[PDB]
Amino acid sequence: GHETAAQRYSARLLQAGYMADYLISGGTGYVPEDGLTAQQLFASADGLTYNDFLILPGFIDFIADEVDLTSALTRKITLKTPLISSPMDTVTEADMAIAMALMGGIGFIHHNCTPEFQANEVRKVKKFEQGFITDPVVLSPSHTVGDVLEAKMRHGFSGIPITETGTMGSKLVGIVTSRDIDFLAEKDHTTLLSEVMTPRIELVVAPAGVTLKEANEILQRSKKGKLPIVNDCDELVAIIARTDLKKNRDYPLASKDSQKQLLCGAAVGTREDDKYRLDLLTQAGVDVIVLDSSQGNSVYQIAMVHYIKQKYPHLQVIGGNVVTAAQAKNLIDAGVDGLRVGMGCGSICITQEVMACGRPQGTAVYKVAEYARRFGVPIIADGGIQTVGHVVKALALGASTVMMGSLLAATTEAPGEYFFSDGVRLKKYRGMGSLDAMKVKIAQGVSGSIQDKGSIQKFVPYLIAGIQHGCQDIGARSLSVLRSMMYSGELKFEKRTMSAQIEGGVHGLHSYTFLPFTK
Amino acid sequence: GHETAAQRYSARLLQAGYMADYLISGGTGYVPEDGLTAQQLFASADGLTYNDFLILPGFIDFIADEVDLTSALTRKITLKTPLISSPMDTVTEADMAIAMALMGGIGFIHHNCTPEFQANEVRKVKKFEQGFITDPVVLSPSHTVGDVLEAKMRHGFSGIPITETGTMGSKLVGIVTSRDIDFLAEKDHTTLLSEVMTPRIELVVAPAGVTLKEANEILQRSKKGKLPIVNDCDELVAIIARTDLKKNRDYPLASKDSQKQLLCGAAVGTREDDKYRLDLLTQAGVDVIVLDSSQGNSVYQIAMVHYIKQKYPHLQVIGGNVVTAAQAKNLIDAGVDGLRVGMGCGSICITQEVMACGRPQGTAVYKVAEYARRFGVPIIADGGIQTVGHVVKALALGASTVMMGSLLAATTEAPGEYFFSDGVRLKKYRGMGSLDAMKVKIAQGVSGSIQDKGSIQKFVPYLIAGIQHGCQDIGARSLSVLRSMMYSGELKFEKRTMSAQIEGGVHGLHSYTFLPFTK
Amino acid sequence: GHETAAQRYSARLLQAGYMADYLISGGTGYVPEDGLTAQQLFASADGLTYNDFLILPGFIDFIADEVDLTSALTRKITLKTPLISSPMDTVTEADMAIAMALMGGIGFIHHNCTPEFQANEVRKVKKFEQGFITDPVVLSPSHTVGDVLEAKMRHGFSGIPITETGTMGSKLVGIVTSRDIDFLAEKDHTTLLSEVMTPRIELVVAPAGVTLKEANEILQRSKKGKLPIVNDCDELVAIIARTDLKKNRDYPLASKDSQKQLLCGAAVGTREDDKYRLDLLTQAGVDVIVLDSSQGNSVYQIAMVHYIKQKYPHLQVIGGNVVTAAQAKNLIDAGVDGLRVGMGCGSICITQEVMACGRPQGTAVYKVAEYARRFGVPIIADGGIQTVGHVVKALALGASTVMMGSLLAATTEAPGEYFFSDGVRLKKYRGMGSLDAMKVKIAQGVSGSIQDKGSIQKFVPYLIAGIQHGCQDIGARSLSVLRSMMYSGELKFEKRTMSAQIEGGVHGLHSYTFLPFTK
Ligand SMILES: NC(=O)c1ccc[n+]([C@@H]2O[C@H](COP(=O)([O-])OP(=O)(O)OC[C@H]3O[C@@H](n4cnc5c(N)ncnc54)[C@H](O)[C@@H]3O)[C@@H](O)[C@H]2O)c1
Ligand SMILES: NC(=O)c1ccc[n+]([C@@H]2O[C@H](COP(=O)([O-])OP(=O)(O)OC[C@H]3O[C@@H](n4cnc5c(N)ncnc54)[C@H](O)[C@@H]3O)[C@@H](O)[C@H]2O)c1
Ligand SMILES: NC(=O)c1ccc[n+]([C@@H]2O[C@H](COP(=O)([O-])OP(=O)(O)OC[C@H]3O[C@@H](n4cnc5c(N)ncnc54)[C@H](O)[C@@H]3O)[C@@H](O)[C@H]2O)c1
Ligand SMILES: Nc1nc2c(ncn2[C@@H]2O[C@H](COP(=O)(O)OP(=O)(O)OP(=O)(O)O)[C@@H](O)[C@H]2O)c(=O)[nH]1
Ligand SMILES: Nc1nc2c(ncn2[C@@H]2O[C@H](COP(=O)(O)OP(=O)(O)OP(=O)(O)O)[C@@H](O)[C@H]2O)c(=O)[nH]1
Ligand SMILES: Nc1nc2c(ncn2[C@@H]2O[C@H](COP(=O)(O)OP(=O)(O)OP(=O)(O)O)[C@@H](O)[C@H]2O)c(=O)[nH]1
Ligand SMILES: Nc1nc2c(ncn2[C@@H]2O[C@H](COP(=O)(O)OP(=O)(O)OP(=O)(O)O)[C@@H](O)[C@H]2O)c(=O)[nH]1
Ligand SMILES: Nc1nc2c(ncn2[C@@H]2O[C@H](COP(=O)(O)OP(=O)(O)OP(=O)(O)O)[C@@H](O)[C@H]2O)c(=O)[nH]1
Ligand SMILES: Nc1nc2c(ncn2[C@@H]2O[C@H](COP(=O)(O)OP(=O)(O)OP(=O)(O)O)[C@@H](O)[C@H]2O)c(=O)[nH]1
Ligand SMILES: Nc1ncnc2c1ncn2[C@@H]1O[C@H](COP(=O)(O)OP(=O)(O)OP(=O)(O)O)[C@@H](O)[C@H]1O
Ligand SMILES: Nc1ncnc2c1ncn2[C@@H]1O[C@H](COP(=O)(O)OP(=O)(O)OP(=O)(O)O)[C@@H](O)[C@H]1O
Ligand SMILES: Nc1ncnc2c1ncn2[C@@H]1O[C@H](COP(=O)(O)OP(=O)(O)OP(=O)(O)O)[C@@H](O)[C@H]1O
Ligand SMILES: O=c1[nH]cnc2c1ncn2[C@@H]1O[C@H](COP(=O)(O)O)[C@@H](O)[C@H]1O
Ligand SMILES: O=c1[nH]cnc2c1ncn2[C@@H]1O[C@H](COP(=O)(O)O)[C@@H](O)[C@H]1O
Ligand SMILES: O=c1[nH]cnc2c1ncn2[C@@H]1O[C@H](COP(=O)(O)O)[C@@H](O)[C@H]1O
């Protein structure tokens, strides 16, 4: 479980110089009751959003850096950070999904594209970091230096083993890399690869049947960039690459599978066409699926959940969008591994004033997460996240992970180009029901634009530090402890009037210019 | 000289199927006279700035890519691009001066710092790209792997040759790079370098007395990252690095000296302390000096020019902001190698409303350049450059090179950090007389801010393409040809009314959003 | 006469190592001709104001601090600084007129008050600093301590010699100062002054007929605060105070008469009642008069000039507001000692759009000053002064002194109270024809308000440094040299288009925040 502020304070006193007290209660020391429990905050029957309340501070006995951010994404997937990139076309193709998985989150690739385009973007994510490279790019020695330059420009790899037949079943005859084609003149599409390859007699190679770690130490001490792995009959089984040891060293939080590939999610719809799409995504090695709709409690979605679970039984599935326990029930009972929570919140959205449907997002996260914990199901809080305070609030109210759109939009890894809208660098960010990119055909999104924020690799550690410092002022050692304090009634809340929201902001200053983080 | 639009058109006709005409004039064909000559434009005796006139289009017989942008900076320095970074604290330290020299321009490092700080920033520029590295980092084999990690942390160089003294006056015992320290655990500051160095029996080395091209080919075919150069007694004379062959390939315009180091300029003032400062800068290998002032026609500046030309007679000197021929005369006669032109123009200025002094910048560039060409002296047009049209206008009016402040400010290579003030990503940009960074002490600058523009290496090729397309539309094959057409009276101009400046902008559109450049 | 930039440069060359040239011209060296002469700038026959032109920079061979700002106010009055405070009720009563005279300018007290109020404000200016105090506060010994406190609260003078009769026509019996009444409790209005005065046997005194300097040395070595001056029969002739030696040390520019009193001016109108008002002002010891009217070329003003000159022939008179040489003629011919120049310029003014009359102020200063110098008459440039650049321009065009309203308004010495208008400290500033203060009775001014600027004693040295630095970039060693360069054609001007005025200011910065001066 977790240890109370009174228990922690009592323990820190017992570690220093400064009786019948244990017999009166014991462990349950006196704390004066102040603020509201989450049960009491939401018993009000009013629509509260992240701006309408505050979390009261606790007792601190740890540094903010010791705060554990480990989170369940689904019944079976754990991420080292609570952060998810939202499956939108102006947010997340492979560049974003790689950057999020490296920083210890995940991305879900968007589906405003062909099945083959989406499966190729998933395949680009899964190939970025590797244990054994088991389907390497291979060439026959009868190819040309111009074919190595073409391969480098088509895939992006220079380290190409050369086997007789030209596949990973033939016999190894050499390797080509950058430093044996890099200096070559315009005689590229004439010089045969046998003229440039480092020949198989020169190679450091390892016998096939070595663990990844044994092979890593062999590669590591060889001082080479590639190590070929070869069976008894001297045939190319796999390669490994020293840049993947560097990627490991460079990114200590990265979300990886057992093959040391980055985790990737993808979106699909609930149409009959989405089954073929799902077949290609599972061939591409996708780790988790979001089903993707305004209103997830439907016969169409409940059918698609049952199909995915009958066909790919090891695959993880997240339920659509829900905002009530009555919606969450039918999807949990259909057998989803997580739920996405939010309807009409989201910076680009107009669904509440178009459809009349939605819910205030603080209430929705609390009500759906409180229902879902009864079955062990994780919640994603989706949309309305404008600040690190909204992330800490979403997590404190019972969300396991937080999904962001506009906060990750106009980073360098978000799709498209900047275009300098109106005296500001200012990138495009749209919404998936925008009618800008998809019978009267009603819009539910608004095609806006967002200020430049630079790289995800510089912006996500600012989110992580803000979440850890928020947990420290609360007195929570981890996100699991934070949610345990909330369901126990130890975590206390205060409501805000309008003037309380105003005094929480910046007041009657003339000029105002905050710098977010400095490194 | 150059060939005229009539001559070019007549030659293009002679190349195709489509008499006594040559005898009437010959070569000088009829063109109807339209617009003004530059001498007529400025004979008006009104203060014209870059917005108050236009250049009329010519005859096109070449592609916008064939346009030669080569420019004289001084009597003896030529740059492959007309572009200079202004010596200001919020614009140009070594990161900017490296980026500008790589893209074929130059930077002048600012002097709002100590003599040792400025000479160290010059030394960082000169060390970034190298022919023979003659003063490499060297260690003795009695040093420890923790010293190599410290040398990487302090200097930035992974590849350290090892000699028995630990200096380049000694026999080479081997080499240490990253791939023989990169995997090491916390036993770094105990393990000796003799346990990790690739010994001199394993090395590829070349005999001292090779040319740089011979040494390049030896290094290149060796496939190693370093080649040590050694004398007859096996002592380390120099090293070369394949990193510099890559830098060369990657940056085809880069402004370099005979030692293959980047060119760097620096600023100094006209005080007695600037004599010592100049000595450190010349020890650091500075290529050119700006004497830096609001008003360069002074006894103090004319003394400093004579001092520099007596003490360092091979150093290049630029005269320090003149706007009249009468000012330019005394500095040209004192023996400067170029002039900086502009006074109280420049985005951060208040000099004209504080001092009453200045001149309108189109007029000043024309008057000073037309006087300076009589003596063969190049002009830098400085300040007021808001657009690529202002660059093309400055160059057409007789400037050899253009110096920019605010246009290069708030790039990634400009000094300082971004601070997200008011829904805009901004960087700090001030002016050198701004009283925010330096007797009543009057201000001449204003401490503003500028919006983010990303990297110089992405923004300067936009300037280059805009300058070449501007030349193509004019009908000029090079910037020398453009200035030759101007002094000959072939290049034609039109004055603009206020309404003409309005119709040259964007009109009564409701929304408006231009993408500057795409690829 | 002045010495030319060519002559100065040639002299600086003769001071260092760096023939027939003197014979070709001699002293008149070659300078390339650039810009316009003032004669040529105004020959254009368009209305130029201070914003429509610039002064071209010269040759510098002195530091900006060597610049002499000495100026003629009238035919017979000289001030150590060109600066005058404008006779308006929101600008100049005695506090402002003292502060301006101390910083080496002058103030003219306003006449929107009673004759006795104006003469009392003049008397407050004249009493602030003193040589011999010839009419001191004197009390008789039959008086109380309560009388000494009432005198201190009615005049402000704590040091009171005690003579028998209680007037200067009597024997001295002691002195009372603050230090021998300050500790007394509230039993004040009982105790006789003979109980508290330092008696005449204890006093250091000097014999009548000592010069002011001899008396200064006696007071100085005595270490006392006062020195009484006494005749041979031991009667009180005068006192002097060490406070005035401190004031003298503290204000080295202060505008003083031969009795070491500050200079003061006053306004009067041209009604019959102004004849009585003038008699009180001359009894108060006023130094100079303004005749204060929108249009000074009137039969009423020419009558009042002849009256003042026939009655008070030693008094200095400034003719009213003129903008043409044809107006200036009839007032110079009536016998004025200076002229005020400007009509409809002035920040609070509406005369041009109400009356159709006025003139552009650059043209008016030039045309009136060029006419007035033929007779040796000084010009005051009045109104439209927004910057130190406008002061330098007005002086360069031929004004001897500059008179300011809105620039001195909302200082601490300007009349009235601050009242914090709209989130800014913001004081009132009205105009004298404003109908806010005073048959349809037409308004000619606009009852506005101005930002706080602190003390005149902190703001006028900023003006002085700005004027001196402006003269230095022009190459003028004094204001007389600046006007000599202008009438000779050595001083050169450039006109400004609209875009030229725009590039002289601050450009497309996002934020902008200049600090005027730092001390
Ligand atoms: N969460 C929100 O607040 C919200 C609101 C609007 C849109 N969106 C987003 O925009 C996108 C579009 O959402 P959507 O709800 O319009 O997509 P959707 O395809 O789920 O629903 C659109 C319509 O198609 C119907 N439909 C779906 N599957 C069907 C099937 N098999 N047979 C017949 N009809 C079927 C639905 O009932 C609905 O009427 C998604 O990316 C979604 O996440 C989100
Ligand atoms: N070009 C412009 O329009 C412009 C205008 C204002 C300021 N600036 C910039 O701001 C900075 C400061 O310019 P500045 O003109 O104030 O610097 P500066 O050092 O040239 O001049 C400052 C003052 O010191 C004096 N001075 C200079 N050397 C002297 C010496 N040896 N002995 C005595 N006095 C001496 C000058 O005459 C001047 O009064 C520079 O970076 C300059 O480029 C540029
Ligand atoms: N300088 C300016 O541009 C300007 C413009 C308007 C007002 N003011 C100021 O307003 C204040 C009021 O003065 P004013 O400008 O109204 O002019 P004013 O008070 O001198 O005269 C007002 C009117 O009365 C007339 N008048 C003056 N003396 C007269 C006499 N003896 N007999 C008969 N008629 C006589 C004038 O001709 C005019 O019509 C002054 O402080 C003046 O300087 C200044
Ligand atoms: N060479 C190679 N690398 C692959 C392949 N599939 C994935 N990769 C990844 O691509 C990277 C290797 O790129 P290379 O071009 O071979 O050369 P490198 O020096 O190892 O990597 P860089 O430093 O990025 O150039 C590693 O991160 C591999 O995991 C493949 O078929 N061949
Ligand atoms: N070749 C290769 N080896 C890896 C990779 N990631 C981990 N390993 C190896 O497996 C070991 C696993 O230990 P860690 O590095 O602590 O755990 P990790 O989660 O796999 O990797 P990190 O992302 O660095 O935490 C490493 O020491 C490496 O030897 C990878 O991408 N490629
Ligand atoms: N080691 C080394 N060799 C260089 C460097 N720059 C040029 N060289 C070599 O010197 C020769 C110069 O030819 P270029 O490269 O065509 O001309 P460059 O002006 O020196 O370099 P570019 O900037 O590429 O034009 C070639 O053999 C280059 O490989 C450098 O930084 N380091
Ligand atoms: N090794 C080394 N490089 C130097 C030195 N002075 C300048 N350099 C430059 O530093 C750069 C990188 O040096 P290294 O770290 O040794 O070589 P590198 O491994 O190719 O550099 P990266 O690939 O960028 O890590 C080259 O461009 C050299 O020209 C020096 O003393 N030693
Ligand atoms: N008591 C007295 N003596 C003064 C005063 N002003 C000047 N003096 C004296 O008269 C002599 C004048 O010398 P300065 O003070 O250098 O010249 P100044 O022109 O009178 O005054 P400044 O312009 O203020 O320097 C000195 O002996 C002064 O001490 C004053 O207000 N009171
Ligand atoms: N005492 C006195 N000072 C006068 C008189 N008329 C003008 N003053 C001026 O007022 C100042 C002297 O004021 P005091 O009240 O005597 O006191 P103080 O000696 O200045 O001492 P503090 O006011 O405390 O600095 C000097 O500058 C005098 O020139 C007068 O009748 N008596
Ligand atoms: N396992 C190996 N055994 C022997 N030689 C190898 C092996 N792997 C690569 N080589 C050779 O080593 C040299 C360097 O290749 P490596 O992969 O280490 O660097 P690279 O990626 O090509 O160089 P760089 O990083 O500078 O671009 C090449 O000549 C290559 O053919
Ligand atoms: N001239 C040389 N002769 C022989 N071996 C060398 C030579 N120069 C470097 N080495 C050795 O070759 C190996 C690779 O070094 P190299 O400089 O080529 O790559 P690196 O820059 O260290 O590799 P990386 O780019 O991956 O960081 C190291 O073990 C190094 O000690
Ligand atoms: N000429 C003089 N000879 C002798 N005593 C004097 C003379 N002038 C003043 N005194 C006496 O000297 C003492 C100090 O006088 P002073 O004028 O310096 O006092 P003050 O101005 O009130 O002092 P403070 O500046 O501290 O307030 C008083 O007791 C005063 O009566
Ligand atoms: O067009 C749309 N209409 C309605 N909701 C949308 C639309 N597109 C995406 N969303 C939701 O908006 C969320 C992102 O919200 P944001 O982080 O506040 O910008 C997504 O994850 C979706 O749940
Ligand atoms: O404080 C200052 N006042 C006036 N001119 C300055 C100041 N600092 C720099 N400058 C000039 O401003 C130029 C840059 O102008 P910009 O490119 O328009 O932003 C510089 O190269 C200098 O000549
Ligand atoms: O009410 C008014 N109407 C017209 N002109 C005025 C009025 N009051 C003062 N002035 C003029 O305005 C000048 C001050 O102008 P300023 O310095 O620009 O504010 C004064 O010296 C007068 O000449």
Side-chain angles (χ1 to χ4, degrees), chain B residues 331-357:
Chain B
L331 297 187
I332 289 168
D333 289 342
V336 303
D337 313 284
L339 296 165
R340 228 217 294 183
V341 178
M343 186 188 196
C345 65
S347 61
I348 40 59
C349 292
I350 52 172
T351 288
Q352 285 174 19
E353 277 64 43
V354 173
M355 310 283 279
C357 277

Side-chain angles (χ1 to χ4, degrees), chain B residues 410-489:
Chain B
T411 56
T412 49
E413 300 89 337
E417 294 297 342
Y418 302 97
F419 59 76
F420 296 95
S421 179
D422 189 16
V424 183
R425 194 179 196 227
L426 297 165
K427 234 180 194 186
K428 174 158 43 71
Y429 178 66
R430 89 214 312 179
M432 289 281 285
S434 192
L435 258 194
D436 183 32
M438 290 68 67
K439 314 321 290 303
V440 179
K441 217 38 54 172
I442 304 298
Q444 296 177 340
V446 308
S447 287
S449 68
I450 299 288
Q451 304 94 306
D452 186 13
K453 290 189 299 290
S455 169
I456 290 286
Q457 303 187 17
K458 224 63 57 58
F459 180 74
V460 149
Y462 157 72
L463 302 180
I464 289 161
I467 298 155
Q468 292 184 309
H469 283 83
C471 291
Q472 196 221 16
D473 207 308
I474 289 169
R477 283 175 177 260
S478 72
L479 294 179
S480 307
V481 168
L482 175 67
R483 286 182 294 268
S484 191
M485 287 169 59
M486 186 271 300
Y487 294 123
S488 305

Side-chain angles (χ1 to χ4, degrees), chain B residues 123-175:
Chain B
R123 202 172 295 109
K124 288 163 58 178
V125 183
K126 298 304 294 178
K127 289 299 305 291
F128 181 88
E129 184 165 335
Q130 299 281 275
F132 297 105
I133 305 171
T134 38
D135 185 319
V137 177
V138 187
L139 294 173
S140 97
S142 188
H143 287 262
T144 179
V145 168
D147 302 316
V148 164
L149 278 80
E150 185 177 311
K152 208 297 192 77
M153 187 171 186
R154 177 154 54 245
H155 302 86
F157 308 127
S158 62
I160 293 168
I162 310 299
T163 68
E164 293 197 324
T165 58
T167 67
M168 65 292 296
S170 182
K171 66 169 56 72
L172 188 66
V173 295
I175 202 165

Side-chain angles (χ1 to χ4, degrees), chain A residues 330-363:
Chain A
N330 293 160
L331 298 184
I332 289 173
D333 289 344
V336 303
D337 313 286
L339 294 166
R340 232 215 294 182
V341 179
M343 185 192 195
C345 61
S347 62
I348 38 59
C349 188
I350 52 167
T351 219
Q352 303 192 352
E353 275 64 42
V354 173
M355 311 282 272
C357 278
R359 200 173 194 177
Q361 179 65 335
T363 310

Side-chain angles (χ1 to χ4, degrees), chain A residues 219-251:
Chain A
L219 167 64
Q220 178 174 286
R221 75 182 60 255
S222 79
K223 321 187 211 301
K224 309 302 181 178
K226 302 302 188 291
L227 174 76
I229 309 300
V230 293
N231 67 13
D232 312 3
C233 31
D234 199 38
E235 304 177 320
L236 182 68
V237 174
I239 75 175
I240 63 158
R242 98 180 293 114
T243 175
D244 299 314
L245 286 304
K246 298 202 300 180
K247 282 179 176 83
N248 160 298
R249 178 202 69 180
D250 295 351
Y251 299 103

Side-chain angles (χ1 to χ4, degrees), chain A residues 178-180 182-183 196 198 220-221 223-225 242 246 249 417-426 451-454 512-518, chain B residues 178-180 182-183 196 198 220-221 223-226 242 246 249 417-425 451-454 512-518:
Chain A
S178 91
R179 299 190 191 175
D180 31 58
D182 60 348
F183 70 86
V196 296
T198 297
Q220 178 174 286
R221 75 182 60 255
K223 321 187 211 301
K224 309 302 181 178
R242 98 180 293 114
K246 298 202 300 180
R249 178 202 69 180
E417 298 299 343
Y418 281 101
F419 75 75
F420 294 81
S421 187
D422 187 12
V424 187
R425 192 166 186 228
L426 220 304
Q451 293 84 348
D452 186 13
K453 288 182 297 295
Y512 151 41
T513 172
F514 101 110
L515 197 183
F517 59 96
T518 216
Chain B
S178 77
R179 291 194 191 178
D180 30 65
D182 59 348
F183 68 87
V196 296
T198 302
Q220 178 181 290
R221 76 178 64 259
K223 322 187 208 302
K224 307 301 182 178
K226 300 298 186 291
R242 95 182 296 113
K246 295 199 300 180
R249 177 201 69 186
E417 294 297 342
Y418 302 97
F419 59 76
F420 296 95
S421 179
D422 189 16
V424 183
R425 194 179 196 227
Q451 304 94 306
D452 186 13
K453 290 189 299 290
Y512 142 46
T513 164
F514 99 107
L515 196 183
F517 60 99
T518 213

